[PDB]
Amino acid sequence: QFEERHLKFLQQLGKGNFGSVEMCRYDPLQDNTGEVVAVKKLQHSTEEHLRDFEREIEILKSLQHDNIVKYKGVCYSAGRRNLKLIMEYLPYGSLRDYLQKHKERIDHIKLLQYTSQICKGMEYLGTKRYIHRDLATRNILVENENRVKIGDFGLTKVLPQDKEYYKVKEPGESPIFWYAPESLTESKFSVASDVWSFGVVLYELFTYIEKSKSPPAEFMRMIGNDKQGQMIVFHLIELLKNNGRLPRPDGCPDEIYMIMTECWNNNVNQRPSFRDLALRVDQIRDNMA
Length: 289
Ligand SMILES: N#CC[C@H](C1CCCC1)n1cc(-c2ncnc3[nH]ccc23)cn1
Hints:
Blueprint: E1 7-16, E2 19-26, E3 35-42, H1 47-61, E4 71-77, E5 81-88, H2 95-101, H3 108-127, E6 130-131, E7 140-144, E8 147-150, E9 157-158, E10 166-167, H4 181-186, E11 188-189, H5 191-207, H6 215-223, H7 230-241, H8 254-263, H9 274-288
Antiparallel strand pairs: 1-2, 2-3, 3-5, 4-5, 6-9, 7-8, 10-11
Helix pairs in contact: 3-5, 3-9, 5-8, 6-7
The ligand N#CC[C@H](C1CCCC1)n1cc(-c2ncnc3[nH]ccc23)cn1 binds at residues 13-16, 19-21, 38, 69, 87-90, 94, 138-139, 141, 151-152, 154.
Subcellular location: Endomembrane system; Cytoplasm; Nucleus
Active site: 134 (proton acceptor)
Organism: Homo sapiens
């Protein structure tokens, strides 16, 4: 639907490093009335990355939910080379940056509003048997002060019809400090490992993204900052096997930390569902108000 010649570059919005997202104006009438949109492209367009990007595009196109960023279309030059994904532009950036910038004015009730929206978006993914695999506040976007959306799906996979997990190992750096133990040890991804990562998201929110309190900083402190390369993963695995966990964030109530620790269960089958997480968050939020 979109022609590359009418996309005017304005700035880069994010880089995630087989791809990037740009802010552009789509101005087909060339009179500066077109709308500002978000444009995702590959940073190094190998055939493998292009096949993955096509699947990512189909996944996002199949999703319609208030808390999932909106698909708008695709753009390609040449024949079908230079594939680009066109999405709605969300003006407040990632939740990670937004939260950090406004920490003094965002209270716990608001954090739980965001939490509940994230759980509803994730439950919807689950109804389609999609596994996000990269849940983190850097992959959540803020549309306005009352609404966030899951904002990136570059690692999302569809479960096989006959299995409840998807086994995949990418080359290179993986966000290991958000990974469930079974993703670290067996490369198994499932709704339940998304629930583990959601617990880490909840942790991030209640730390208000304070620098020294990030999951990597906390876990590296727990394993020893001396550790390097491949040993980091090994020690993380052992740390999690021994029920080492991220600490309760400053100011976080016990009942919210308990949601985190229940998501961080070593037993995959005992982690809560996204519907129950949303139910519990909404009950705490009602109580607080
Ligand atoms: N979410 C998320 C992270 C994602 C980066 C991670 C991988 C490529 C870019 N990203 C998307 C954006 C963005 N910003 C503003 N409006 C948008 N709409 C669709 C994506 C998007 C900024 N960074």
